[PDB]
Design a protein around this ligand. Structure first.
Ligand SMILES: CC(C)[C@@H]1NC(=O)N(Cc2ccc(C(C)(C)C)cc2)C1=O
Length: 557
């Protein structure tokens, strides 16, 4: 029962890979300690292969089956629709990997007869054949980090034609089923502000709250055939068209359960018997499986009044405390149960008694004050990785602008406001690129966003208090200040001076640009303005946002 079998053929790149931080005239204004920042490349793929290759053993008890029967009962209330070829095509990212069958993501989106005819052939093949493993491409991801160096993460994905077919069969399923099954526990239904609220209310709802996060070591490689067949049985509980039931069974047997691994050169790298990281069902399957194993492990450990919060493999549990020594014992029994279920830990879970000290989705709750002096809870994170990626993006154009996604997701934070907003608005001003739409990622999905719409977006997601937060906690301020020293990022006093300039420059341009100046940089002036709601913010269609997670799902809006 190995997660993977290998042939020895290397995981190869598509193009030239850069590992060292590229430097330009703008680099030193953001970060001075260049040797701290690196990108992962296919060079390190071999080390990741060793890490993800292990034997999985599963022992399934009555808690597991009891939780599963309940999840199936809730899933049986879902009615999912089959997406048309047109709907599935328009959800394809413009720069999605081209098919091996002579058409690309632009041909898909434009409904070109060659692309549509190939789509109808893969579809016909899925209905007629439920046995033949579907070929996948294994590629090393190029991701930027700060040191103290990780090996490249791997992406496993099927051909463009299959990805469009996954959309037709399962887009409605993966978008509606997890919230029905898990209710408030499904993390991807919340905006960052709704998440902070969910976490604070849950913590408050316990008499003696105890919280922990559970890190499953290499979650995708811990996922067994059983887990993948169990996810399918959950999907089949829905009220589906018979053609969809057929495509779901077929995609499960032929792709989701496993298949051969092919490099960018066309060589067989080996075989996968675990979760594929680049399929439509990666996020949904991981969230359902993580929730099933943890809900069963909560019952095994006899955890009192457990509230879970699940986003793929990211798991947070808020429960009733039985005192520090019993809680430590409860977590050992929880870990033992998770291990038996084939979800062993990376770092052992640690009980926490301060909500602010709990990290989930690489984030923690923190407190600041709005203009009226009210204590406002918001979500933040260690800024090291957002800052290292901002440094890379300062010198290289990338298919996914992390800085824009970070400004959207972490708009009320000290570091996103003072550094990210200031730095990138300065760059866009100098290049006259404020109106240029940039692609970013929100819950794994791709969005093309105009930076000029940032104030309207921030207002709708976080409220006007995002533009007015002050009096950040000493814990938060010190983490940011330490991070800046570590990376050689100028101190925050430099950023406030620079932001006054970025603000004056945005105001000068008038219109949408002045709106960015007025709202985004109101913190930088001593004589603050009274910020009122933006009329355009109500006109924004923010549906599709915070409904589901689509990490590795090839989704564009
Ligand atoms: C921020 C951006 C670079 C990118 N987009 C996204 O949804 N995540 C994952 C993510 C980010 C924030 C959250 C919170 C906890 C703030 C809702 C959850 C998941 C990313 O890392």
């Amino acid at each position: 029962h190995m997660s993977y079998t290998w042939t020895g053929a290397l995981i190869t790149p598509c193009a030239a890979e850069e590992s060292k931080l590229p430097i330009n005239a703008l680099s030193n204004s953001l970060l001075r300690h260049h040797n701290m920042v690196y990108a992962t490349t296919s060079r390190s793929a071999g080390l990741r292969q060793k890490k993800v290759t292990f034997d999985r053993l599963q022992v399934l008890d009555d808690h597991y089956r009891d939780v599963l029967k309940e999840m199936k009962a809730k899933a049986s209330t879902v009615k999912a629709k089959l997406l048309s070829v047109e709907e599935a095509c328009k959800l394809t990212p413009p720069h999605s990997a081209k098919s091996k069958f002579g058409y690309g993501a632009k041909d898909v989106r434009n409904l070109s007869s060659k692309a549509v005819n190939h789509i109808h052939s893969v579809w016909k093949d899925l209905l007629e054949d439920t046995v033949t493993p579907i070929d996948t491409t294994i590629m090393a991801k190029n991701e930027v980090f700060c040191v103290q160096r990780k090996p490249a993460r791997l992406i496993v994905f099927p051909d463009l034609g299959v990805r469009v077919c996954e959309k037709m069969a399962l887009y409605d399923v993966v978008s509606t089923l997890p919230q029905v099954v898990m209710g408030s526990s499904y993390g991807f239904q919340y905006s960052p502000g709704q998440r902070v609220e969910f976490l604070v209310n849950t913590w408050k709802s316990k008499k003696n709250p105890m919280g922990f996060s559970y890190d499953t070591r290499c979650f995708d490689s811990t996922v067994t055939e059983n887990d993948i067949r169990v996810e399918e049985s959950i999907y089949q509980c829905c009220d589906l068209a018979p053609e969809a039931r057929q495509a779901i069974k077929s995609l499960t047997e032929r792709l989701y359960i496993g298949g051969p691994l092919t490099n960018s050169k066309g060589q067989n790298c080996g075989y996968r018997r675990c979760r594929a990281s680049g399929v439509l069902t990666t996020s949904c399957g991981n969230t359902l499986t993580c929730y099933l194993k943890a809900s069963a492990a909560c019952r095994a450990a006899k955890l009192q009044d457990c509230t879970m919060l699940v986003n793929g493999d990211d798991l947070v549990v808020i429960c009733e405390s039985a005192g520090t020594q019993e809680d430590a014992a409860s977590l050992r029994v929880f870990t033992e149960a998770m291990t038996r279920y084939s979800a062993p830990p990376g770092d052992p879970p640690q009980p926490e008694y301060d909500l602010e000290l709990i990290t989930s989705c690489s984030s923690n709750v923190s407190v600041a004050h709005d203009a009226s002096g009210k204590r406002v809870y918001y979500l933040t994170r260690d800024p090291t990785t957002p800052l290292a990626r901002a440094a890379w993006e300062t010198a290289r154009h990338t298919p996914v602008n992390s800085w824009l996604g970070n400004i959207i997701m972490y708009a009320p934070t000290l570091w996103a406001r003072m550094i990210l907003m200031t730095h990138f608005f300065s760059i866009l001003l100098a290049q006259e690129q404020l109106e240029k739409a940039l692609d970013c990622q929100i819950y794994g999905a791709c969005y093309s966003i105009e930076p000029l719409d940032l104030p309207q977006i921030i207002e709708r997601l976080h409220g006007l208090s995002a533009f007015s937060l002050h009096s950040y906690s000493p814990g938060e301020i010190n983490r940011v200040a330490s991070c800046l020293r570590k990376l050689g990022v100028p101190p925050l006093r430099v950023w406030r001076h620079r932001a006054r300039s970025v603000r004056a420059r945005l105001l000068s341009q008038g219109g949408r640009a002045a709106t960015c100046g007025k709202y985004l940089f109101n913190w930088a002036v001593k004589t603050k303005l009274k910020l009122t709601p933006i009329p355009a913010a109500s006109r924004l269609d923010l549906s599709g946002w915070f409904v589901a997670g689509y990490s590795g799902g090839d989704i564009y809006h």
